[PDB]
Design a protein around this ligand. Structure first.
Ligand code: ZN
Lengths: 375, 806, 127
């Protein structure tokens, strides 16, 4: 556990991507159910979630040419969520709008480092490989299905003046008994509609998230139920199949419900290849980035790993000496971490350089190598 | 590919608003009552009332106000519907042929805007200068009342106060002035604005803002010579008029929140107030300017949804949760200390939460037993056709579920009463209900930090066994502490010939959001006493239970479980099925099992007797709030959902692809207008174009029937509806296709796979010329294979055959 | 699975001298190419056991890496700069040969070789 004095804004800044980039403040948002033709990046095998900051490092002349083309147009590219990425089988995905770019000279080859952010979910309609090799996709935007208050249909015309509200569980019982009163006119009670209300699930997930992130729910967490659900999903250590099943959900209510169900059930994180070697527990998860405990990062190789920061981690062997080269968390040094049974690469043990820092040592595990398990 | 027919067997009985004025004539006194999709006009006599006209609209009456602009002889009627159809109407009577002509009509729905939390708020200016509509937050729509506005054009004005609670037009002002109660982070405040017609904006009001009570709910506009506005909350009834600031806090109204009001004296000296629990108070204004406010408890009426003062001291109380009342107010208190004496009672079947069909008196003549009302207005309603005979049994406690047991000649009813925390330690009942006055009453055995509070309400659930003949509360068994009863079945299982009442429960606690504990209890009734036969614990809420081929199909949160009845009289688990949704709705048919979630998530499973477990057949996920589900037939499943709508889904057993065999096609959609609650198989007519019969109950007391048609008959009825929509004038001239269109604010589609029966049955009401016009150039009777021409008498016979199913 | 022992770095019989070209290559070229972010695969010899490449040393007859060049420059194994330049070009040529053109490691090697060729024209004459 221990206390923290790191200043967490640097993870989100991705200072390992050279100096200050050329920031973009514009925003391109297309209409709902509007079919657009978007190019697809080749070397991105991630299931992107809206709002999740995505760093990238591309050096292929094809990649840099496509990036130079997109910088001049709408700065929006598609990120396919592959069910079976061995054959590029995609059915869902999420758009990503570029907000920072930086080409680097005094360097061997022409390379560009990019910071983008996820935007709009979408269904994949047509994947067309050009003669160039790069592929385009005709794609329908998927809308956000926010449903009204479940009592607005039953609602009594006279009780309309009681639907505005000026020791927390007393307040929540008052909220339940006042909002969903007309539930007595239906075949189901108040506590059942409390399970399908937005604010109740939001507060339950806030209680569960106050365990990891010590930042107050005043400003760090969003207010919109859809934005809150997406922010929670961005830092949910689950495998790729369950992340696909979660991205399929359109109604934010079901998203929050499945999120809290996952938080209730999945307690231990094991190795994906071993399936029988506990790596860590949900209790040890602590937040080190503003985006949450798990955030996406990129290495000089060009690979993007979803790093989840934990305080303790069991059943791991350490490989290599510590190194500060291209460290995602400035002021710390990484060391390769293999599984104790299958030797699969699980993550990196990050140790502090200066002795005044805290935590002096933590772990950053990649999401692609972990698997949630229930005992 | 649905081919269905829905018909209204009982028009809605709930009263959701009423007014008084001079609509039919200047010398007459007219009482206008709204019943969701029905409008009733009466002439107030010294006797009581007199029925002059009842009409039906193509929209849910949300706003209903009377007004007379300068230049008319009698009052006009403004009406707004749930689909934002606005219309101004006039009364016209020439001898006997009465006609409600449309003076103005229009669709006022904006292109953008989120509907407010306070719903639709329509108000009218005293000098008849404009009509104000509150629909979306931060947007006040104005319709100027000029002689040329026939399309009802409206313009929007911006509000800095987004969360508006209530608003009323003030009396006695040069410019039209509004007074409203809003909320900001500092608290709740009241504020006045002046609407300009030249500038189409707001100007500062006649008096600045005030910081009012934190629960200021209602606003009353006081006419001249008093003026100003009264602000009423749960604990204070204040008054503001320029510099005049008066405030009181009578403790008599601290027992319940006041909801509705009505003006007694035209000058504004007396007002009627109604609280939630049904208490009726009198608010008196004492005299150039106001002297003092006084609250005096008149008496106890039905749970008033709306109030109106007729004359002679007679008051009408419109109630959705209970019967509507006509009462008398005396000047002296009686023996019990009340000023109210009941005069007459009008039936109100809403809300219907469950029901069952029985062959009571005559074998074949089906009758319907429904759990209606809530709180002290709860009751059992026994309905049979003769237009419809209804027997009432008031229970004075909220009913929930109900089923019939034939061998014991009785009914099992789940009910719940409200109790308050005792001063010493326990619970005390507000009123003696059916559970506290039973011939026999027992409690259950067994198998809580931060307990109780200071005088808060708690629910207490009971299973009532009631005789079918005398309707005496034979037994009133009580369940455990902090327990909620959900399911109720009466059936025989296994080789046991005993019929049992099986009840599913759930342990509901303040700290647990989702219940993780529940009971399935099996009672047997005989010799006038109930003995708890069996009890089985489960790890969740038992939302619903079903009899399935001699076994018990139960739903425990996200699990579906099957129980067998052993010779040791114990429930034995056979096979489970774990889903992605919590099984709320459970239905069966032979070997098919239909599971439904609150958000329209539908699943269809099949029992494999040789394998002994459940296999997934099909499913469909379309997010929308639900209410009730029913299995029409092997390939047809009916349900209801948000915005008062019905739908029917189809599967494909044979089909073509394994990936598409597991999908349910949305073959039927329809807009009802009533919030449906519970479907059930049965028919009320003595025992054909139709196949099947499923009755359904609603919230506003409406009762309907759904049945299945063929292909040729469906096409013929669709053509008949298209022809009848042209020749029939609509009250307010609202399009029938616009009224029956599946209207959710996320998507609007036309109605398919459903034949509106109220339109087909109005074919006999119109005259013979319209009949010969509608039957003109038909020839779509593709039953023989070729074209079969139709005549008027053919269709009269067919329609009269379609009126002999309900 | 031969994984032949890495090339010899020190030789006591070989003479030790620090010419201008060699100390420049060690203090400029090697440091620059080492603190690059595309240099990790060449900091170490090709461990053909881990990478499961049984055909690397059967095709690459003269292995070389930048770590071996560093350990040779630090031991003064080189007599002239021709040897160091030959070792650099040998590493680049092996990386080009074993892999197919257009691969990621090939592009990294091209970048490193371009930087090396633009840093090698700044060759000062011997003292
Ligand atoms: Zn492992």
């Amino acid at each position: 556990p221990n206390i923290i004095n790191f200043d967490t804004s640097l993870p989100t800044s991705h200072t390992y991507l050279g100096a200050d980039m050329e920031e973009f403040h514009g925003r391109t948002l297309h209409d709902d159910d509007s079919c657009q033709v978007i190019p697809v990046l080749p070397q991105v095998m991630m299931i992107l979630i809206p709002g999740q900051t995505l760093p990238l490092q591309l050096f292929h002349p094809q990649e840099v040419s496509m990036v130079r083309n997109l910088i001049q147009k709408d700065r929006t590219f598609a990120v396919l969520a592959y069910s079976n990425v061995q054959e590029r089988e995609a059915q869902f995905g999420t758009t990503a709008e570029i907000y920072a770019y930086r080409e680097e000279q005094d360097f061997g080859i022409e390379i560009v480092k990019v910071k983008a952010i996820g935007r709009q979910r979408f269904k994949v309609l047509e994947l067309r490989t050009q003669s160039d090799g790069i592929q385009q996709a005709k794609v329908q935007i998927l809308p956000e299905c926010v449903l009204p208050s479940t009592m607005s249909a039953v609602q009594l015309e006279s009780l309309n003046k009681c639907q505005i509200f000026p020791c927390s569980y007393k307040w929540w019982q008052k909220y339940q008994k006042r909002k969903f009163h007309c539930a007595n006119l239906t075949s189901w009670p108040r506590w059942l509609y409390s399970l399908y209300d937005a604010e109740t699930l939001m507060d339950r997930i806030k209680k569960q998230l106050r365990e990891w992130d010590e930042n107050l729910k005043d400003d760090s967490l969003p207010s919109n139920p859809i934005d809150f659900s997406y922010r929670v999903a961005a830092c949910l250590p689950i495998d790729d199949v369950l992340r696909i099943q979660l991205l399929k959900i359109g109604s934010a209510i079901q998203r929050l419900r499945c999120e809290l169900d996952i938080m209730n059930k999945c307690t231990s994180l094991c190795c994906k290849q071993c399936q029988e070697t506990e790596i860590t527990t949900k209790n040890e998860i602590f937040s080190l980035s503003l985006c949450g405990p798990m955030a996406a990062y990129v290495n000089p190789h060009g690979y993007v790993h979803e790093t989840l920061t934990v305080y303790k981690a069991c059943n791991l062997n350490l490989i290599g000496r510590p190194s500060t080269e291209h460290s995602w968390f400035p002021g710390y040094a990484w060391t390769v971490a293999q599984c104790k049974i299958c030797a699969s690469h699980i993550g990196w043990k990050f140790t502090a350089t200066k002795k005044d820092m805290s935590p002096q040592k933590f772990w950053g595990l990649t999401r692609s190598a972990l698997l949630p398990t229930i005992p | 590919m649905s081919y269905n027919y829905v018909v209204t067997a009982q028009k809605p009985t709930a009263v959701n608003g009423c007014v008084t004025g001079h609509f039919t004539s200047a010398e007459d006194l007219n009482l206008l009552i709204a019943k969701n999709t029905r409008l009733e006009i009466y002439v107030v006599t010294a006797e009581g009332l007199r029925p002059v006209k009842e009409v039906g609209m193509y929209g849910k009456i949300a706003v209903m106000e009377l007004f007379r602009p300068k230049g008319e002889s009698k009052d006009l009627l403004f009406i707004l519907t749930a689909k934002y159809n606005a219309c101004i109407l006039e009364y016209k009577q020439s001898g006997e042929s009465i006609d409600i002509i449309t003076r103005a009509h229009g669709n006022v729905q904006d292109r953008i805007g989120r509907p407010s939390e306070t719903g639709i708020i329509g108000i009218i200016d005293p000098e008849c200068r404009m009509i104000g509509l509150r629909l979306y937050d931060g947007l006040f729509k104005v319709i100027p009342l000029d002689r040329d506005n026939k399309e009802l054009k409206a313009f929007n004005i911006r509000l800095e106060e987004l969360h508006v609670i209530d608003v009323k037009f003030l009396y006695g002002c040069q410019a039209p002035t509004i007074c409203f109660v809003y909320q900001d982070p500092q608290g709740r405040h009241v504020k006045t604005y002046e609407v300009s017609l030249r500038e189409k904006e707001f100007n500062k009001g006649p008096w600045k803002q005030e910081n009012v009570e934190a629960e200021a709910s209602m606003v009353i506009a006081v006419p001249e010579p008093f003026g100003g506005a009264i602000i009423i909350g749960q604990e204070s009834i204040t008054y503001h008029n320029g510099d005049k600031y008066l405030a009181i806090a009578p403790p008599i109204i601290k027992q319940s929140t006041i909801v509705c009001h009505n003006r007694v004296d035209p000058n504004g000296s007396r007002y009627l107030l109604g609280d939630m629990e049904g208490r009726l108070f009198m608010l008196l204004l004492e005299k150039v300017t106001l002297k003092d406010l006084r609250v005096e408890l008149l008496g106890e009426t039905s749970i008033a949804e709306c109030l109106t003062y007729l004359d002679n001291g007679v008051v009408f109380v419109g109630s959705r949760l209970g019967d509507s009342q006509l009462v008398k107010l005396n000047v002296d208190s009686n023996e019990q200390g009340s000023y109210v004496v009941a005069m007459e009672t009008f039936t109100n079947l809403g809300p219907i939460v469950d029901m069952c069909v029985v062959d009571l008196e005559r074998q074949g003549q089906g009758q319907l037993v429904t759990c209606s009302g809530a709180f002290k207005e709860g009751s059992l309603r026994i309905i049979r056709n003769g237009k419809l005979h209804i027997r009432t049994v008031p229970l004075y406690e909220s009913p929930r579920k109900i089923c019939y047991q034939e061998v014991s000649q009785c009914f099992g009813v789940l009910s719940s009463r409200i109790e308050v925390q005792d001063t010493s330690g326990g619970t005390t009942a507000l009123r003696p209900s059916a559970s506290t006055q039973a011939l026999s009453s027992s409690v259950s055995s067994s198998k809580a930090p931060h307990e109780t509070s200071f005088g808060e309400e708690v629910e207490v659930h009971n299973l009532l066994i009631i005789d079918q003949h005398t309707f005496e509360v034979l037994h009133a068994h009580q369940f455990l502490q902090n327990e909620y009863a959900l399911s109720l079945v009466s059936c025989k299982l296994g080789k046991d010939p005993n019929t049992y009442f099986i009840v599913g429960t759930a342990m509901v606690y303040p700290e647990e959001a989702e219940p993780k504990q529940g009971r399935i209890v099996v009672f047997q009734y005989s010799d006038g006493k109930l003995q708890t036969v069996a009890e089985k614990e489960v790890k969740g809420a038992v939302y619903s239970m079903v009899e399935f081929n001699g076994k018990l199909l139960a739903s425990i949160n996200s699990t579906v479980r099957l129980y067998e009845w052993t010779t040791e009289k114990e429930l034995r688990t056979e096979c489970n099925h774990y889903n992605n949704i919590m099984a709320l709705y459970l239905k069966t048919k032979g070997d098919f099992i239909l599971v439904g979630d609150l958000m329209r998530s539908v699943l269809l499973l099949a029992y494999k007797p040789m394998e002994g477990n459940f296999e997934e057949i099909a499913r469909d996920f379309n997010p929308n709030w639900m209410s009730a589900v029913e299995i029409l037939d092997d390939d047809n499943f009916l349900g209801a959902e948000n915005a008062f709508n019905l739908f029917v889904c189809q599967k494909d057993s044979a089909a073509t692809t394994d990936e598409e065999r597991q999908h349910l096609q949305e073959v039927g959609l329809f807009h009802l207008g009533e919030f449906v609650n519970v479907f059930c198989h049965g028919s009320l007519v003595m025992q054909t174009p139709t196949q099947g019969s499923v009755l359904f109950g609603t919230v506003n007391g409406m009762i309907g029937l759904v049945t299945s048609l063929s292909e040729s008959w469906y096409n013929l009825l669709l053509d008949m509806q298209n022809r009848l929509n042209k020749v029939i004038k609509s009250v307010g001239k609202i399009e029938h296709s616009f009224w029956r269109s599946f209207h959710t604010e996320r998507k609007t589609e036309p109605a398919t796979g459903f034949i509106d029966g109220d339109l087909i049955e109005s074919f006999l009401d119109i005259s013979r010329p319209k009949m010969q016009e509608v039957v003109a150039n038909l020839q779509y009777d593709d039953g023989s294979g070729m074209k079969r021409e139709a005549t008027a008498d053919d269709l009269i016979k067919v329609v009269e055959e379609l009126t002999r199913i309900h | 699975s031969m994984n032949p022992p890495p090339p010899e770095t020190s030789n006591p019989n070989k003479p030790k001298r620090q010419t201008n070209q060699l100390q420049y290559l060690l203090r400029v070229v090697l440091k620059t190419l080492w603190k690059h972010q595309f240099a990790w695969p060449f900091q170490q010899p090709v461990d053909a056991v881990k990478l499961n490449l049984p055909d690397y040393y059967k095709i690459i007859k003269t292995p070389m890496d930048m770590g071996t060049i560093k350990k040779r420059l630090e031991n003064n194994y080189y007599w002239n700069a021709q040897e160091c330049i030959q070792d650099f070009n040998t590493m680049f040529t092996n990386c080009y040969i074993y892999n197919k053109p257009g691969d990621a490691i090939v592009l990294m090697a091209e970048a490193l070789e371009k930087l090396f060729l633009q840093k090698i024209n700044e060759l000062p004459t011997e003292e």
